[PDB]
């Protein structure tokens, strides 16, 4: 019987021989938790026009946070965009008036979700009106909401007052 | 092995000044259009380095302490630099490292080496048929107990001699951190008379050796030729320096390369730049 | 291996205390009693398990531990081992092996 | 007003890389090395400093 | 009546991504046992394997081994462990002599030929060579040390 005896000895010298790898499929333009070599994090992988130095695998911003990474296998420049996040704003009239409620998102378009978009973010549960009236509920980007007329919540541009020549 | 060169003449270690030399990429982190500050072993700007040379009546292959790290700069024509000898006792009593270039591959091994008083490589019979082929090996008599071996990719090195200005420049950085040898390399042509030229260059990573041994001393391998104590050396100059834990301001351009470096301690002016973390002092 | 945060063949298989456990652990040497001849089979333990057992849980499943792809069919064999095992007890055992 | 705000924001962010006495500034690193009872000791230092 | 922020929404990761380099530039472990001739029990060669990646799943799932056993380390855990130095021993011994290979063993081949220290963390592999080494008339090329 031919016998092959493998002697495993761990000395003070650095380690080299290691087990196999995985290298699963890659996904882009989605929120996912990615682990590249000894780096981990959560963000959106998007290919940008930046060019990393051949000897520099990982990049960093002024905050020491990596905004992009290079595929350990294939050669590509992938920008790391954090997943969508923001504050939850609830615009509703007082309990005495009505129970109607309008949800508002900040710094993000409509994703999760009368779904309308504004400069401040996604606004659901409201109606867009072209007629500008006096501000009622402050929102942002020069936009105010109010409860009016079979009445609901509408979103109109904040008026600066009547015109006088 | 125990024979010493007859033509070799002893000379005092003359010193020269370096301008920006000793700057290198600290890590693999990519950065652009930003100014980063980091501390590591560096060669201070406007510092004093050592002046060595090799020629057919003075030849320099002295021993020098490695300490934490050192900086090497040499102007070459025939690529007279054959490698370096790294070891604690520089004998078979311990494990010594040899980085050598045979003109084909880069041989890097860690074994128990037999140390020669004056190691080198001779080359005979140039004349016609320019030759330039290694023949005798004085680096080590024998080797055993090898815990490491490495060989680079095949390449063709031109050892033919040249005249006029030196056409080759090799500046390397050797250091040991957590038992990891770091080698940074840069090669660019220059027009030089003596000392060092005024300019900036950023060294790049070459190889990474996880050997994990202590090196208290080192030597600089050189190539000798004659048409083994009677060999002669060609005209060449190489330099050595000591690295210190100094903080530099590395200015990154839009492409990611370092435009210029600023030593936090030079004069009262530079200290103001690291205080403001900017190169513009109002 | 019995204590909050501790791991081992006990905490990871049969008996595990939670990390926030508040209590008192008492122990004494019964070797002069529990030890009978060559061993006492009244006290057994789970040697092998496919995952880590949570604290405050008792799993009596005797299912054969299968480390391979070959079906064990409830019997020992290649990559098939019987997880429940007995503590060897003897009066001559060392302090480490005494009950 | 713009510079004072930029320094406050830049400062606030760069503090995340500080150890604050902890072994490392990364949370998953401490959780992936020390035991549950040992990690909480280090994680508290980060939470306290941050 | 007014606008109130009751919380801060955050998008959770849908799935986890994994990426690494290739498996290329390995050590030819298959050629170690595939070698035509092996050294004698006294002549056993010691091969030093380092600076590569090792895949042990092919050797275990190939069913080309007669007996496979490890000491101190499980076969499934080898893939997740990095080792600095790996020495692969090669030699030929009798069938009944394979049982003497292990930490703290005895016998002729163990004491007078090859022995395993009590702390040996490696593994053992054997397969029947009767279809190669053994030939008509007998093969005396493989010897052993009987007395010491």
Residue numbers in the entry:
A (entry chain D): 508 to 620, 641 to 676, 689 to 704
B (entry chain A): 14 to 69, 77 to 247, 255 to 309
C (entry chain B): 409 to 507
D (entry chain A): 951 to 1000
E (entry chain D): 310 to 457
Article excerpt on this structure:
The spike (S) glycoprotein of SARS-CoV-2 mediates receptor recognition and viral entry into cells. It forms homotrimers protruding from the virus surface and, once engaged with the host-cell receptor–human ACE2, undergoes a substantial structural rearrangement to fuse the viral membrane with the host-cell membrane. The S protein is also the primary target of the humoral immune response during infection. A large number of SARS-CoV-2 neutralizing monoclonal antibodies bind S protein, especially its receptor-binding domain (RBD), providing a basis for vaccine development.
Four cryo-EM maps of the Kappa S trimer engaged with ACE2, including Kappa S-ACE2-C1 (only RBD-1 up), S-ACE2-C2a (RBD-1 and RBD-2 up), S-ACE2-C2b (RBD-1 and RBD-3 up), and S-ACE2-C3 (all three RBDs up), were determined at 4.0-, 3.9-, 3.9-, and 3.9-Å resolution, respectively. In Kappa S-ACE2-C1, engagement with ACE2 induces an upward tilt of RBD-1 relative to the S-surface from 72.5° to 77.1°. The Kappa S-ACE2-C1 complex generally overlaps with the WT S-ACE2 complex, yet appears a bit less compact, with RBD-2/3 slightly tilting upward and NTD-2 tilting outward a little. Noteworthy, for the Kappa variant, ACE2 binding induces a more pronounced S-trimer population shift than that seen in the WT S-ACE2 system, suggesting that the Kappa S-ACE2 complex is prone to transforming to the more open C2a/C2b (51.7% population) and the fully open C3 (34.1%) states. In contrast, for Kappa and Beta S-ACE2 complexes, they all present pronounced population shift, i.e., with only 14.1% or 8.3% population in the one RBD-up C1 state while the remaining dominant population existing in the more RBM exposed C2a/C2b and C3 states with two or three RBDs up and possibly engaged with more ACE2s.
